[PDB]
């Protein structure tokens, strides 16, 4: 188990760690989060009590370094940093651990939720979507735009998701206009899976990362990306059978985890009704269709 310690908490803030969250008061004796499960990416995120503008956070993997948070009063945010002196890092954490100044990652033993949300998410793929090569961890916030969004404006601060556009030359072979527009299998299997992602695991990783950025930061371009990647699969007549089974599991756990009260803003009615009831794969998402119908029957 690994630890993200905090030098201090000088401003009142709601801290998220994966799907969990807790409130810290101004100048409370908080010095971090312990017992973080090894083997998964994680995200530690923030919403300031006095300015809910800009949710922001950091994707990281404790196997890649020793990372801690210190508030920066100049830029006004909690920043992740890497401690390269391992002996120093261990002593500061042991001192925090001995004085019981850390919260424990509150994982229930039965509970596979975080694994199910991050099964295909890898840090190395995150670091290519979020380009800041001098850090091993990746900053995301509420307002960051996507490359595709910027095409329709600081490129250094963009989310470089794979651009999907159903009415583009990339999606449509000359001479197969009707075929390729009504059946996206070419675009899915040749352009995207074989061509760009190399395999379905990388495709699902980006899909899962897009959802998580949408949910945890309210990042609108991430929500656009998540829906586009779902629709591209559902709108293809020819999809490997293992991909559809895995998609149903992925989506089920995303819908299960979504806050009920954010459904109006995080779920696109058109895409979901198309995917569950009209598309080629309308019958291939049994688990997702059942939870959607029982939890969000209004959307449908």
């Amino acid at each position: 188990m690994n630890t993200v310690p905090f030098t201090s908490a000088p401003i009142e803030v709601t801290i998220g760690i994966d799907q969990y969250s807790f409130n810290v008061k101004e100048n409370q004796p908080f010095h971090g989060i312990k017992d973080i499960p090894i083997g998964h990416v994680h995200v530690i995120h923030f919403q300031h009590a006095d300015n809910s503008s800009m949710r922001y956070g950091y994707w990281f993997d404790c196997r890649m370094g020793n990372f801690y948070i210190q508030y920066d009063p100049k830029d006004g945010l909690y920043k992740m940093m890497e401690e390269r002196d391992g002996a120093k890092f261990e002593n500061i954490v042991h001192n925090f651990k001995e004085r019981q100044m850390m919260v424990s990652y509150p994982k229930i033993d039965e509970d596979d939720t975080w694994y199910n949300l991050t099964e295909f998410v890898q840090m190395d793929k995150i670091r290519k979507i979020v380009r800041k090569d001098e850090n091993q961890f990746s900053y995301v916030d509420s307002s960051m735009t996507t490359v595709q969004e910027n095409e329709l404006s600081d490129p250094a601060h963009s989310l470089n998701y794979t651009v999907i556009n159903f009415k583009s030359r990339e999606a449509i072979r000359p001479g197969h206009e009707m075929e390729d527009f009504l059946d996206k299998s070419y675009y899915l299997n040749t352009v995207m899976l074989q061509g760009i992602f190399k395999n379905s695991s990388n495709y699902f990783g980006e899909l899962q990362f897009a959802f998580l950025n949408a949910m945890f930061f309210g990042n609108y371009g991430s929500s656009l990306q998540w829906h586009a990647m779902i629709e591209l699969i559902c709108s293809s007549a020819t999809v490997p059978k293992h991909m559809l089974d895995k998609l149903d599991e992925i989506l089920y756990y995303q819908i299960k985890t979504l806050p009920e009260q954010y459904s109006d803003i995080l779920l696109n009615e058109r895409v979901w009704n198309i995917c569950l009831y009209s598309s080629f794969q309308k019958n291939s998402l049994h688990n997702t269709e059942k939870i959607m119908e029982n939890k969000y029957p209004e959307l449908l």
Binding site: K167, S168, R169, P174, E177, M178, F181
Partner: protein, 237 residues
Amino acid sequence: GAMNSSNYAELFNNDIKLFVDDTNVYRVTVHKTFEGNVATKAINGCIFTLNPKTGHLFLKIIHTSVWAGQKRLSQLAKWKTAEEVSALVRSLPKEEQPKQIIVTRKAMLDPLEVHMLDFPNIAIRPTELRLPFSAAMSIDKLSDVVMKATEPQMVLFNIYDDWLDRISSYTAFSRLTLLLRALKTNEESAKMILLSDPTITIKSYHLWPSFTDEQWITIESQMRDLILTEYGRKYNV
């Protein structure tokens, strides 16, 4: 975006544009079968592609053989229309290619946009105007060439005959739409009005009769009377 009454003069400015109407592309008769089921039989159709400024009409005849062995014909008909319009644009010299294509039915938007991806600078637009171009097959010489076709064929017409020698394209388009609206609402009476006087004839190289200016005013008045008469018969007014 969409084209309506607020930007109607845009139709007659010097930017090349075409209207595309697909109503008459897929045409069928519906009949009982020997077993008492119902079956369709297709008949020849046409794409109506019109430059509203010059009157040039690109009539692509859609021969029934294009439907042979195909499924979902009403959907295919929109994509075949978009394919043929795209092919027409590619066949035109650059300086003759349209800057905008206005489709009369919104279901043509995506098929035409997808077929015209190679032309990102040609705007594909819908219209809020209700244009009576379905009635093109009420023009005898257009109907004749469509039904007689034995293979796919493109035939070029000027739907304004020689009217632009005497009137503007705004007025010519208004006359056209009034004539087509009348032929759509009561074809028999409209044709009666058009051929009522044997003295006025249709030139071999024209579609409509050779009316003088004063006779065209009389004709236009009778067409409006027809549309109002039919509106009253329809709604009991």
